[PDB]
Each structure stands twice: as structure tokens, then as C-alpha cells.
């Protein structure tokens, strides 16, 4: 087509779209000429870079700050060979429907920001190097669909351009950027609006489907205000994350030819484990950090302050961090009941400089007032929301309440928020960071000595700010778990307010994780797993969210039955006991075949090589958080696993699970819908009950 199909008859026009689904959207469209020959600079994707960017001084930063716009998307939209499009498709809030032209004015402001400072070169070089690396270190391709894709672009490109498709850029075109800046004008705009509220209002019907819309041209006073009246507000271009992206080299394995992470440094300040990548040899690194500190679970007020600290800390650093995250280094900050949770994942090239600035950043921390109020109110909503969630989460929350040492309820957390002031937190902050313990996982193609020097550097910076001193090795305590008095079957009830659903969790204390008990509990769990799939949903018809199985907490095993439904809880208990009878005789009716297919099922259930350094690193971290470190428990437990009999789990079954049982540790929790011994005070309940031991660290 030697001509665009939108020839000025339909420019500067709106549409009002009636959807079936209750969605609301805003659609800005620009038709633009062919730059397919201009694959050297690709300004349309450069505009897609600059529109959907979320960074310092960005448009969407203020649009969130104005609370009108959820998300946006923009960029070059292909059409025919001749014409191309430039679309912007935005989601709508309630009050987004009143400020439409304002929004568009801000878009214009952005265009004008590009019109003031003109084109940029270092942005093009930065995006050029980042897509050069992202093309170099691609991951995979589905064997079906790939071929249809590159065959889709096989028509348009010479045989050297079929793989370096758009993933490589030769030259710089400032005239094109001037051209598309001339294309981004209000003369060029095409508007469409989606809203359910367009009833009785759209007469002009679509030809094929039969939806209804309206031409409804924008008047000119709204138009003319955009062009000539142009000034700048709070918008500034985004900054760079260069950070020396050179060293992607793989490092060869040294004398430390361990297959599992070794503790390369232990002090009273920190504790450091290290593991070069043997199997994957990738140019990546993953880092996990625990900062242990006493002040975590001291009182509901300290917990709220820790929460808000990390929460607003995330809110502070997000605006700085997202453009570096855009470079291919993802992270997470979360909390523990014990301390803080730090994830650093990405390439090897610039994690030391980035993590350095992260520590320097979260060291020196400030508070805004209304920001504190919004986050405060927001978590306040999330807290008194907790009356209104799913009863399986309710059941797991009450189980982790009852079966730990100390536990602060969400009610206390609700009431205590009257006192969270800026000075009180601001007194709390240097006290917390003053004295703490570190624990870290370093895993990837890295060295031990540079890991020690960088880690040293980090904790030295920690001492540099607040004169950090290490913790004492007697206050690395953990909370123990309550020992049932060997016979008790206790129960109580909890009444939900919102959900007309009754959760229930049926806890069983087996034992600490010994090497026998892991395979006892896993194998017995699976032997009651698949016939439960046969009998519970189909035959007993309890509910749809019906779950059973292990419990891994504080180094203590457990057995559970998570069921949320709308039932009487004792009725539901009775059919659970019917399922217990079903599994009890289903033990004694086992053939050799059930046994053998089942243990092979467990085997393939357990056995798998890792598939990414983050997976194995997550399993190793998952072992460091339990402080067990049994790196080859896999092989031992499997080697043990084949050494079981039918009678091996019978003798496992009886003493804990039968009705005439001496070691029966049973306890349920009733969650009611909106309509043994009793437990009056859970403190006075937990008063005279013993505590379990801890695990000897190997």
C-alpha cells in the first residue's frame, strides 16, 4: 500500500467501546511511515523503550503518583509493508475517566521533554550493549513455533539477518528521531475508550461483530492548548546502570573440588559458605543473605517497625533499582521472623558494585511523612483484611501459632498501630542495625578469595556506618516446639467472620528429622496421597480444597490435613477418620506391586538434577535456613528408601496413629464459617506442656 489507510478523515477522533467483560481501557494510536529499511537505529522500538520505561522522572512514575493509571504500553506497532503504527494502550481506574486529556497532556509533556534536550546517544549505546548481551546469552527456543516465527521474518530479511533479526543495531539516525517526533503530534492521534458504562450511548455499529461505537471528534480548544503551551514539570530522563558489563567469562574449578558449599568463613559477626558452579557453567551468579538480629520478634511493635522498615525500604529503592533490574539482575528483599532476607541474582559483572550501593543505600535511610501514612494505612488494610481470606491460610496461621514457642496475634498487630510515629521508628532504626549477625550464600562461577574480600568489605562498611559490633553466640537462639503429653487429643474452634467456609487442620507430631523419619514420613505421606485422590474428592466428596501431608518447621516433622469447605467440623473429622481407617486397612492390603510402583513413584518424585543455579541454590539456602547442611541427604535417604518393607511402615503406623495408641499425638484446629479438652487461654494452655529438643549441627 503506497498510502496509509487513515487519511485525515479519521484523525483526532475518539471511540467508545462496549465490552462483554467488565474491563476499562484507553487506546492511543499513531500511524507512522516505514522504517523497516532503517533497521540500523530502530527508533520505533527506541520509543517503545522510552515509553514503557519505569524510571527516574518517568511519566508512569508521576501517573502512579497522580493515581490515575495502573499501567501503560507504547511502542512501534507493525502494520503492512508500507505503513506502521504507534499505539498506546492504557488501563483505566475510576478517576482515570475524568482526567483523560490531562494524561494526554502529560504524554505531550514527555514528547516535549524529548523535544527540548533532543536525541540521546548514550541511551542508544546502553540499550545496544544490553541487547547485544541478551542476544549473546539467549536461553532456548521451543522446537515448535520457533520455526514459524523465523519463517515469519524469513520473507523480509536477507539470509544474514534471519537470526540477528532486530537484535543488533548498526547506526544512529537523528533525522528519524526528529521525524517520529514530528509524527507524535496531536494532529496524528487516534483515540479509543473501553468502558462498561457506555450503555445507550454508542449508535455507530461495527459491521461484522456488531459492537457499537462513536466518532465524536475532540474540539479544537483542547487541541490548541497542547501544542503552543509547552513547559516542564517533574519529568527528567532516566539514569544509567553501566557498571562495567564486561566479565562474563567462566572460571575453571580449583583444588576446592567440592560438590557442595563449604563454610569458607566463620566469625562471630558472619558465617560464609561458598560453591562454584560445576554442572551448568553459566555466566551467572546468585546471592542470598540473612542478617540475623535480636530485635525481630521482641514485640508486635518491633515487628511492625521491622516490617515498615523493609517495606518502605523497598518503596525507596524500587525507583532507583528497577532500571538496573531491567538490565537482567533480579533481586528480592523479604523478612524472616529471625532476621532479614536478601536475594541478589544475576550476572557476575556488576553485583559487587550494585550490592555495595545497596548496602550504602539501606544503611542511610530516611522517611517521608505522607508516604509513611499511605504505607501505614495500606498494611493496616492488609491487616484488618485478614478476617476475609481463605481458610487454608487461616488454618496454617493458627497451626503456626499454636505449635511454636511464642506467637503474636494479628489482633495485637491491629491495635498497636496507633503508636507508630516517625521519632519512635527513627529511634528504633540505628538500634536495630547497630548489632547483628550475617549469613550468606555465594554460588556461581566466582572465586573464594574475592568472595572473602568483597564480603569483608561489606561487613566493614556495616561497621563503617554505625560502629557495628558482632552478636554474642548465646543469642543465636531458636524457638522450640511444644511437646504433647504423649496421649492427648485436644481440639478447639475459631469462628470466621467473613467467609462462610470452615477450614480444619489435623496436626500430628511425629518426630525430629532423623534420617529414618524423613523417609518414614515422606513414603507414608505418599502412600496416603494417591488413594486419597481416589476416595476424597470423588467418593467422600469433602470439598475441592482438600490437602494432606508433611510439615517442615523448626526442624520438626509433622502431619496435616488441610481441608477448607462449608461443613460441620466434627462431621468432617468423622469422615477424615473414615479416611484414616481406609488408609489403615489399605496398608495391610498392599501387594508387592503397590509397594514397588509406589516406591519407584517416591524415587522419581525425589530424584531430579537441578535445572538452574537458582533452583539448587534455593535448595541449599533452604537447608541453610534450617541449619542442617546435610548436602547429601538425598543419596542417603534414597539409599535408605529402598531398604524398606511392608512391615516397616506398619511398625511406623501403629504407635502414633491407631486409636489405642501410646504415642498418639493428635490435635485439630476448627475454623468456623460465618454461622478432648477445651483451650481457654492459649498461654495457660501452653503453660504446662513440654518443649522439643533441637538438632545437633553436623
Amino acid at each position, epitope marked *: 500500500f503506497p498510502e496509509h489507510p487513515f487519511q485525515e478523515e479519521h484523525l483526532k477522533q*475518539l471511540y467508545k467501546i462496549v465490552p462483554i467483560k467488565d474491563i476499562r481501557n484507553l487506546y492511543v494510536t499513531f500511524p507512522i511511515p516505514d522504517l523497516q529499511k532503517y533497521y540500523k537505529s530502530n527508533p520505533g522500538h527506541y520509543l517503545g523503550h522510552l515509553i514503557g520505561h519505569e524510571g527516574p522522572g518517568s511519566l508512569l512514575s508521576e501517573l502512579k503518583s497522580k493515581g490515575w493509571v495502573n499501567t501503560l504500553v507504547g511502542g512501534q506497532k507493525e502494520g503492512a509493508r508500507g505503513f506502521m503504527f504507534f499505539i498506546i494502550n492504557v488501563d483505566l481506574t475510576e478517576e482515570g475517566l*475524568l482526567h*483523560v*486529556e490531562d494524561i494526554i497532556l502529560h504524554m505531550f509533556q514527555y514528547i516535549q521533554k524529548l523535544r527540548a534536550e533532543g536525541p540521546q546517544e548514550w541511551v542508544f549505546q546502553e540499550l545496544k550493549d544490553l541487547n547485544a548481551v541478551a542476544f549473546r546469552f539467549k536461553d532456548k527456543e521451543r522446537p515448535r513455533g520457533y520455526t514459524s516465527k523465523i519463517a515469519g521474518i524469513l520473507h523480509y530479511y536477507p539470509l544474514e539477518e534471519v537470526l540477528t533479526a532486530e537484535y543488533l543495531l548498526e547506526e544512529f539516525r537523528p533525522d528519524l528521531i526528529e521525524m517520529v517526533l514530528d509524527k507524535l503530534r496531536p494532529e496524528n492521534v487516534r483515540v479509543a475508550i473501553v468502558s462498561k458504562s457506555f450503555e445507550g450511548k454508542t449508535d455507530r455499529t461495527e459491521e461484522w461483530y456488531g459492537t457499537q461505537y462513536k466518532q465524536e471528534a475532540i474540539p*479544537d*480548544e*483542547v487541541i490548541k492548548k497542547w501544542q503552543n503551551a509547552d513547559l516542564n514539570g517533574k519529568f527528567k530522563l532516566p539514569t544509567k546502570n553501566e557498571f562495567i558489563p564486561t566479565n562474563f567469562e567462566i572460571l575453571p574449578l580449583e583444588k576446592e573440588a567440592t560438590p557442595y558449599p563449604a563454610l569458607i568463613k566463620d566469625t562471630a559477626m558472619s558465617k560464609l559458605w561458598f560453591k562454584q558452579d560445576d554442572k551448568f557453567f553459566l555466566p551467572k551468579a546468585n546471592l542470598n543473605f540473612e542478617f540475623f538480629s535480636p530485635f525481630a520478634y521482641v514485640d508486635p511493635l518491633h515487628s511492625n517497625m521491622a516490617y515498615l522498615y523493609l517495606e518502605l525500604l523497598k518503596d525507596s529503592l524500587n525507583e532507583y533499582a528497577y532500571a538496573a533490574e531491567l538490565a537482567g539482575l533480579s533481586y528480592d528483599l523479604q523478612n524472616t521472623i529471625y532476621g532479614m532476607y536478601l536475594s541478589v541474582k544475576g550476572y557476575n559483572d556488576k553485583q559487587p558494585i550494585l550490592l555495595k550501593k545497596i548496602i550504602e543505600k539501606m544503611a542511610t535511610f530516611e522517611i517521608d511523612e505522607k508516604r509513611f501514612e499511605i504505607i501505614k494505612e495500606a498494611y493496616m488494610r492488609s491487616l484488618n483484611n485478614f478476617r476475609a481470606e481463605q481458610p487454608h491460610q487461616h488454618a496454617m496461621y493458627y497451626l503456626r501459632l499454636l505449635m511454636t514457642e511464642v506467637a503474636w496475634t494479628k489482633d495485637e498487630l491491629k491495635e498497636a498501630l496507633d503508636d507508630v510515629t516517625l521519632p519512635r521508628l527513627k529511634a528504633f532504626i540505628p538500634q536495630l542495625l547497630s548489632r547483628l549477625h550475617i549469613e550468606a550464600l555465594l554460588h556461581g562461577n566466582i572465586t573464594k578469595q574475592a568472595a572473602l574480600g568483597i564480603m569483608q568489605m561489606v561487613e566493614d562498611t556495616l561497621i563503617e556506618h554505625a560502629h557495628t559490633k558482632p552478636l554474642l553466640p548465646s543469642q543465636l537462639v531458636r524457638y522450640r516446639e511444644v511437646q504433647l503429653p504423649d496421649r492427648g487429643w485436644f481440639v478447639y474452634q475459631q469462628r470466621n467472620e467473613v467467609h462462610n467456609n470452615s477450614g480444619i487442620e489435623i496436626y500430628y507430631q511425629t518426630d525430629m528429622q532423623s534420617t529414618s523419619e524423613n523417609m518414614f514420613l515422606e513414603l507414608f505421606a505418599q502412600i496416603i496421597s494417591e488413594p486419597a485422590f481416589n476416595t476424597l474428592r470423588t467418593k467422600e466428596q469433602l470439598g475441592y480444597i482438600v490437602f494432606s501431608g508433611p510439615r517442615r518447621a523448626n526442624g520438626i516433622q509433622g502431619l496435616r490435613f488441610i481441608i477448607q469447605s462449608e461443613k460441620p467440623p466434627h462431621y468432617l473429622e468423622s469422615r477424615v477418620e473414615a479416611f484414616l481407617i481406609t488408609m489403615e486397612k489399605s496398608i495391610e492390603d498392599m501387594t508387592e506391586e503397590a509397594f514397588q510402583k509406589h516406591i519407584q513413584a517416591l524415587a522419581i518424585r525425589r530424584l531430579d538434577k537441578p535445572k538452574k543455579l537458582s533452583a539448587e541454590s534455593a535448595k541449599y539456602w533452604g537447608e541453610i535456613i534450617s541449619q542442617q547442611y546435610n548436602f547429601d541427604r538425598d543419596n542417603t535417604e534414597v539409599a535408605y528408601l529402598k531398604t524398606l518393607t511392608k512391615e516397616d511402615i506398619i511398625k511406623f503406623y501403629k504407635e502414633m496413629l491407631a486409636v489405642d495408641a501410646p504415642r498418639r499425638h493428635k490435635v485439630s484446629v476448627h475454623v468456623l464459617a460465618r454461622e478432648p479438652e477445651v483451650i481457654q487461654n492459649m498461654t495457660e494452655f501452653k503453660r504446662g506442656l513440654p518443649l522439643f529438643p533441637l538438632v545437633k549441627p553436623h
Partner: antibody
Amino acid sequence: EVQLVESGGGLVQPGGSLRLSCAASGFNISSSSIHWVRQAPGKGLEWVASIYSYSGSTYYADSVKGRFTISADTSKNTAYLQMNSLRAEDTAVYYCARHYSAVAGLDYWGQGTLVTVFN
Amino acid sequence: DIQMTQSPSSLSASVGDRVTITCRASQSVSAVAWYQQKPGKAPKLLIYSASSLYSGVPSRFSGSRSGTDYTLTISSLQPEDFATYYCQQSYFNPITFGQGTKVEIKR
């Protein structure tokens, strides 16, 4: 060529909630659009509100944001303004007025009407 | 939200006098009107865009923009040109006015 017939503005007690008619004959509110203006007796002016009936775009002042609700019928080329939270400083004279194609050009007007929230 | 400094409150000059009235925005912006309204009557747009004359006004009126200084310029007064004035910045931002500029006579 321009006809701005605003009416319905009378006298009212606090706590009420009433509409605000304006008949914009001679042009379309889908074209260059109308505004509301707060002129108290013996005082200066103040732009109340503005609907864009082609897009439903409301815009309020800093003082009376939220408490007022403007609306627009394009089928009769006629806008309205529902009012809420009436206070004693609202004794004024209000005008419907056509803004035309200019940067600040609001040229035509109507006779106005007296809106009174009175002790 | 950018306010307006209406200067002066009022002034006095006779028929055939040169009257310059400076309103002043809170910020250095471009989008400013000028009005006239005799009491109990609808207003009139004297000067749109702070420099141009609206059609339907006698040609003894002009506007001028000087940076932030926004000036209504009256070349020659008339016996009917004694009325309340109003200057007006306009954006999508909420629109404020001045308190009124009254034109009185010299004697």
C-alpha cells in the same frame, strides 16, 4: 449564534443537593465546551467546574473538589451539575459560559442565576 | 494552581487616557485572559492570549506579555469604559481569578 441559557439556580438551605441546568443552544458541548463560575455578591470570580461531554472529563477547583458532580446530556446538548455538601459561603451568582478556540478564550456567557446558601 | 496577583485593585483615569493594568502570575508561564463586566451583567473577553484582541470590543484595548508581567493596555478611555475587570490564567489546573479591577475617573 451562541445561546447560553442557564437557569434553575434559586435559593437553598445547607444539606441539600440540586442540579444546575445550562442550555447551550447555537453550538455543541461536543464542540468547544462550557464552564461554571462562582461569583459571590461583592466579591471576585472563581471558576467552579468543567465537563467535557465528548470525553466525560470533569475538572474541579481546589476548594470544591469532590463535593460537586457535573454531568452532560449530548443528546439534548445540555449539561448539568449536581451539588453536595452545601455551605454558607455558596451564596453567589453562577454563570454558564462558552470557551472558544483560544488559550484562555472564554468569551460568551449567559445572564447567570443566583445561587444562595443562606443563614 | 498557579495563582494571580491582580494589580491594582482599582484606578482612576478620564476619557481619552492611557491605562495599563498588570496582572501577575505566581509562576513564569505563557495562557491569560482579560475581562470586563459591568455589575449585574455577564462579563466580556477583552484580551485573549494576553496579547490579542477579541472581536466585538472597541479597538482602544490591547494586551501585552512581558515575561511574567501580563498587561492589559487601554489606549483611550471612554465614558462607557468604567467597569470591573478580571484577568485569568487558564490550564487544566484549577482556575483562579482576581478580585476585580474597577475603572474610575480623574477629576
